[PDB]
């Protein structure tokens, strides 16, 4: 890797989990464990080489039609991925964040992340951020909602909104737009995930199932990265 | 094919102009005249096969940073396209359209364009959506301050905005979401079109340049999608 150009942030959309249970003929809920633990994989190398921030697509707005024994495994399972692995996280000085709408969220897991939030708030290194109960759209529905009134109540006019201006009321206002977008399992489509803030992101469509991907498939996205030629529209 | 689902909304983003022409040692603007040939043989196959939008990523907000000469080249090009090719647009029964800021377009390119969009107004067919002068973060800033007023002038709150609201203040609230996204010239990413609409959509990153993308090309594309699986977030 070119040391220099260490992607600042980069986005996963972790995709593959039920396939990977389904391979083994074992129940999709078991891909998702397993893909818990991976997370903690990719969380010690990108926070190793130094990347800034790592946002991960935990559960969207649209993954509510999937059965109920799967979507209360998934929203459980932030409880037990902090437990066994919080004390490593503020070892690493590594700063535990959430976007999305995660009010929605199972009692015990809001708590369970309220507090590795509390307990990394003063945290310098890796900011890892998990995207639960996020979409881009429902993101720009409340942003704007909040934007309509943040304005009428300052005694503004619309003239001020520009796209700085949105970049600012996001969810991710506080964090660059990633350079680079990966998502597992070969599927080729983001799904929702930071619709806005991906506008001219780099995307790697790597072949790996989630729980299969590991640090050495990170690197090797790295170095397709930094191959790649980028030109924001100029020559 | 299988003509039960052809999509009915197929988005391009029409890339790799310049290197077509710098392989062939000839200016950049070269690579643009042929890139706009190219437009009509696409054209011809996405009506023949029965596709009912085809949007074409013809000029970015963005892409103002080029050479000058290259911007007047490209904003030039549709005169030259409309003169030779509006005939048989009205008689293919193609209803030409465009997204964008169009306004800023070179006067004679905005009256080229208005007489084409006047002589195939009602027609029925394939819609051929020029989008030019367009980007998707100033879509939706434009969508966004044309809300806020709408909202206050019809004596509403915010509560009604939602994302179909959204939709339906998009340049593309005539339009379904594209299907298919494709991009040509090996490059992986969106480079802001459409990034509102392209939420679900499948993506192909085919490896032609432009110019060199044709119709057998088209149709191998729409076979790959044919085999995508998509899931909309559920199982
Ligand atoms: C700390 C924390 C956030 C823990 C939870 C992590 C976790 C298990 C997130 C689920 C990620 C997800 C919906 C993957 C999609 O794979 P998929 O189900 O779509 O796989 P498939 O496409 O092969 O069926
Ligand atoms: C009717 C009508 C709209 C005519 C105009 C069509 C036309 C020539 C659009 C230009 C499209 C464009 C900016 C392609 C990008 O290739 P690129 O310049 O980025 O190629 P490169 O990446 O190989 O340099
Ligand atoms: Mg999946
Ligand atoms: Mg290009």
């Known amino acids: 890797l070119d040391s220099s150009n260490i992607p600042e942030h980069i986005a996963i959309i972790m995709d593959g989990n039920g396939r990977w249970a389904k391979k083994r003929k074992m129940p999709r809920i078991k891909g998702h464990y397993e893909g818990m633990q991976t997370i903690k994989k990719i969380t010690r ?4 080489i130094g990347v800034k921030y790592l946002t991960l697509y935990a559960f969207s707005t649209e993954n509510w039609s999937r059965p109920e024994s799967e979507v209360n495994y998934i929203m459980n399972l932030p409880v037990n991925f902090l437990k066994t692995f919080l004390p490593e996280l503020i070892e ?3 700063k535990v964040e959430t976007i999305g709408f995660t009010d929605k969220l199972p009692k015990s897991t809001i708590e369970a992340i309220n507090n590795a939030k509390e307990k990394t708030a003063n945290n310098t290194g890796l900011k890892l951020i998990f995207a639960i ?15 309509f009134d943040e304005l009428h109540q300052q005694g503004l006019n619309s003239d001020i909104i520009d796209e700085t201006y949105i970049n600012n009321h996001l969810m991710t206002k506080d964090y660059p737009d990633p350079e ?3 998502r597992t399992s070969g599927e080729q489509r983001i799904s929702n995930f930071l619709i806005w803030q991906v506008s001219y992101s780099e995307f790697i ?6 729980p299969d991907f590991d ?14 030629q980028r030109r924001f529209g100029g020559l």
């Open 215 to 228: 640090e050495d498939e990170l690197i090797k996205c790295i170095k397709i990265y930094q191959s790649r």
């Open 205 to 210: 469509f790597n072949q790996k199932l989630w």
């Open 133 to 147: 109960n996020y979409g881009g759209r429902a993101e720009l529905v409340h942003s704007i909602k909040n934007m």
């Open 45 to 48: 190398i990108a926070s190793d």
């Open 180 to 182: 680079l977008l990966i």
């Open 92 to 94: 690493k000085n590594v």
